[PDB]
Design an enzyme around this catalytic site. Structure first.
Site, mmCIF file in Angstrom:
data_model
loop_
_atom_site.group_PDB
_atom_site.id
_atom_site.type_symbol
_atom_site.label_atom_id
_atom_site.label_comp_id
_atom_site.label_asym_id
_atom_site.label_seq_id
_atom_site.Cartn_x
_atom_site.Cartn_y
_atom_site.Cartn_z
ATOM 1 N N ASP A 102 -8.520 -3.083 -6.413
ATOM 2 C CA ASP A 102 -8.454 -4.143 -5.408
ATOM 3 C C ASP A 102 -9.301 -3.800 -4.190
ATOM 4 O O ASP A 102 -9.080 -4.437 -3.095
ATOM 5 C CB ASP A 102 -6.956 -4.384 -5.032
ATOM 6 C CG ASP A 102 -6.371 -3.277 -4.163
ATOM 7 O OD1 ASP A 102 -7.059 -2.264 -3.935
ATOM 8 O OD2 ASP A 102 -5.235 -3.459 -3.693
ATOM 9 N N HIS B 145 -6.952 -5.767 -1.467
ATOM 10 C CA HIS B 145 -5.933 -4.990 -0.783
ATOM 11 C C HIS B 145 -5.649 -5.506 0.583
ATOM 12 O O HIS B 145 -4.517 -5.349 1.054
ATOM 13 C CB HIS B 145 -6.555 -3.563 -0.608
ATOM 14 C CG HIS B 145 -5.514 -2.501 -0.344
ATOM 15 N ND1 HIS B 145 -4.705 -2.081 -1.395
ATOM 16 C CD2 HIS B 145 -5.107 -1.797 0.762
ATOM 17 C CE1 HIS B 145 -3.877 -1.125 -0.934
ATOM 18 N NE2 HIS B 145 -4.101 -0.962 0.358
ATOM 19 N N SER C 213 0.814 -1.148 0.000
ATOM 20 C CA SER C 213 0.000 0.000 0.000
ATOM 21 C C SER C 213 0.898 1.268 0.000
ATOM 22 O O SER C 213 1.939 1.293 -0.679
ATOM 23 C CB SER C 213 -1.011 -0.066 1.160
ATOM 24 O OG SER C 213 -1.820 1.052 1.205
#
Ligand SMILES: [Ca+2]
Ligand SMILES: [Ca+2]
Ligand SMILES: [Cl-]
Ligand SMILES: [Cl-]
Ligand SMILES: [Cl-]
Ligand SMILES: [Cl-]
Ligand SMILES: [Cl-]
Ligand SMILES: [Cl-]
Ligand SMILES: [Cl-]
Ligand SMILES: [Cl-]
Ligand SMILES: [Cl-]
Ligand SMILES: [Cl-]
Ligand code: NA
Ligand code: NA
Ligand code: NA
Ligand code: NA
Ligand code: NA
Ligand code: NA
Ligand code: NA
Ligand code: NA
Ligand code: NA
Ligand SMILES: [Zn+2]
Ligand SMILES: [Zn+2]
EC number: 3.1.1.3
Lengths: 387, 387
Positions: B316, B357, B112
């Site tokens: 995602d 994610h 991320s």
């Protein structure tokens, strides 16, 4: 017994299934054993067959079933269709029983995932959808009568081998590939090859809402590789999602038994318990695909966190037997063992039959199972029901 | 693949994340699936974990990573601290790897926004900051070695699901309240409540520079209301600013690939394309918070004048997939598809994985994703890199 109602029977298939003229006339309802709808008609039980998308969500299938019964163009709901990204309108049907708009009732007999779809159809008929009603008011769009509520016309729902709490088959590691190999094994029962580019349609998956259809020149092998990668496999608006333990619990949270409908369940098992740990194993005579591909997994997969334990291991080759007597996970519906009197508004558990998921509809042979008696006894019980 | 270097791996979270003793030991790296650092150590790949301010700028987080790695007090730079109105000095750390001051190196694996922080750390080690150097001379104050330039200790940076070009999620109208609801959803995945004034710290946002900390008697709900109104959400020196497409392109104008470091990127997607207008929708099994709150927007927001077009819709659940293979907007870095040989000084695009994610770090389940094999295969590839 005495006849107490005149409601016809309507047959509804699961996550495979096709209309009477499809599959070169090999019937889903009767398979190698004959034509169950014809047995019932011939014995005075008027019976029809629905054919809805086999892989579509129970919601989509319920909207399709409603238009096939009352006639008109399938309407999935403007709110639903916008949320999942598919067409709001589907096919147009003449109606099997457009009289149901005015009055009159049916009995639904449903196999496998058809039992979820039948339950959902009753809930939508009686209560509609508050989400669809609010969305139509907010956006100034039309609303199908299905979503109004106030249209209950289903006297009974009978489910046969239904995964009311899901099937643990969805959790198998190769489930995507094995599920489409199960579609291929059902084609092969009908003498339909998966590597032949059929010009005629043969088996219509009814995926107009998603824009999908097997293309000129395309084998089922090639087509199922496309379906595996498509929204009817990868979205939550699918049979696959509603078939799982997760998704069946979500369905059970809102799809409850109507107090105005008799519910009957039949459970199936075709396995034996082993001597080692309690796992279940396929019996001799289980359909070969299930016996090799699916039953070993179903009879041994546990998930302690979800309480999927030794009671889940008995199975009929496709669905865990414990799942079939009625919704329990996420459900407040009551389930009672049949005691000679059928009761409205609860599940009447009619027992567990030693017949596998495909034998109970005649798709796989089982000469010890008197399939004609089974369906004629059931039709006589449903004709006895007092509205 | 034969081992060619002995550099340890260092794990680096995004805009959520916390150290191994935080969250009662529930790991960011592994979540409900286990402990990725422990898997890696137990297989012979020495691995450590960083914890930096989740909501702080990439600049702040790189200064904090630097201190945690080599040891000492975090030093944000006198010019930066005066410009943004926060303290120059942060916490003091013992140093995980003081051997980096004598030639040791690391591989950073970042999730991320961690991938923006990892790239910024390498840029500052290589080039320092001319603004800091200028200011220290002019005001007669000390200067951190980080700002001198001419340093190197990162052999590789691997980014997973990083918004190198930003994420359009920030353009959601109520983004502020749904971003803190995401923080509460991650606490709930860790089995931590948001309405309880825990006396232990549980999740430290490491806001020493801003003078902010959860008070005695304060729940996370109340604390997050204060944070929303605080400089770590309202200033430009924030993860929020760097997360946006605008702020990510500003970052890319100065944070460039070093010739001395290999860069690997993994991209993630968990959506299907619908049948109406080509929007993207969340797949079955996406984490519920993203599926409900974030993915419908990410899959439908377009802005043609800013080049946000069909390529940006796949996502995602939190970041647009097209943003993740390497920085492109405002960047001169090169990105090459992996071809079996990893290259220094360029982004090696290692592919796109059908994992969301939070699934990719184990915070949300996904039994079909073999998370342990994914990280072990990556550690073996990083160990094979020529130094
Ligand atoms: Ca058989
Ligand atoms: Ca998941
Ligand atoms: Cl043909
Ligand atoms: Cl098509
Ligand atoms: Cl088709
Ligand atoms: Cl056993
Ligand atoms: Cl037979
Ligand atoms: Cl090295
Ligand atoms: Cl470096
Ligand atoms: Cl404070
Ligand atoms: Cl669409
Ligand atoms: Cl999992
Ligand atoms: Na939309
Ligand atoms: Na077709
Ligand atoms: Na048995
Ligand atoms: Na038995
Ligand atoms: Na229950
Ligand atoms: Na807890
Ligand atoms: Na996808
Ligand atoms: Na560029
Ligand atoms: Na997968
Ligand atoms: Zn639908
Ligand atoms: Zn700062």
């Amino acid at each position: 017994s005495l006849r107490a109602n005149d409601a016809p029977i309507v047959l509804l298939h699961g996550f495979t299934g096709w209309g009477r003229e499809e599959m070169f006339g090999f019937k889903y309802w009767g398979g190698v054993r004959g034509d169950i709808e014809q047995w019932l008609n011939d014995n005075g039980y008027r019976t029809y067959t629905l054919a809805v998308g086999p892989l579509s969500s129970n919601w989509d299938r319920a909207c399709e079933a409603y238009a096939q019964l009352v006639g008109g163009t399938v309407d999935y709901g403007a709110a639903h269709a916008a949320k999942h990204g598919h067409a709001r309108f589907g096919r147009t049907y003449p109606g099997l029983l457009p009289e149901l708009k005015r009055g009159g009732r049916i009995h639904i007999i449903a196999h496998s995932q058809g039992g979820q779809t039948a339950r959902m159809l009753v809930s939508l008929l009686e209560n509609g959808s508050q989400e669809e009603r609010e969305y139509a008011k907010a956006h100034n769009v039309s609303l199908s009568p299905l979503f109004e509520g106030g249209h209950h016309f289903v006297l009974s729902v009978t489910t046969i081998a239904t995964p009311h709490d899901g099937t643990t088959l969805v959790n198998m590691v190769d489930f995507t590939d094995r599920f489409f190999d199960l579609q291929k094994a059902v084609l092969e029962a009908a003498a339909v090859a998966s590597n032949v580019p059929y010009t005629s349609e043969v088996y219509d998956f009814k995926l107009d809402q998603w824009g999908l259809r097997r293309q000129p020149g395309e084998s089922f092998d090639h087509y199922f590789e496309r379906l595996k990668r498509s929204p009817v496999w990868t979205s939550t608006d699918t049979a696959r999602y509603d078939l799982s333990v997760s998704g069946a619990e979500k369905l059970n949270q809102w799809v409850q038994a109507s107090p105005n409908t008799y519910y009957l369940s039949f459970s199936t098992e075709r396995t034996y318990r082993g001597a080692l740990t309690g796992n279940h194993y396929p019996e001799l005579g289980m359909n070969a695909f299930s016996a090799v591909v699916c039953a070993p997994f179903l009879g041994s997969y546990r998930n302690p966190t979800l309480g999927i334990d030794d009671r889940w291991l008995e199975n009929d080759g496709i669905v865990n037997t414990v799942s079939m007597n009625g919704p329990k996970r996420g459900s407040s519906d009551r389930i009672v063992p049949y005691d000679g009197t059928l009761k409205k508004g609860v599940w009447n558990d009619m027992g567990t039959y030693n017949v596998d998921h495909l034998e109970i509809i005649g798709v796989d042979p089982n000469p010890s199972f008197d399939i004609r008696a089974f369906y004629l006894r059931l039709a006589e019980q449903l004709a006895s029901l007092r509205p």
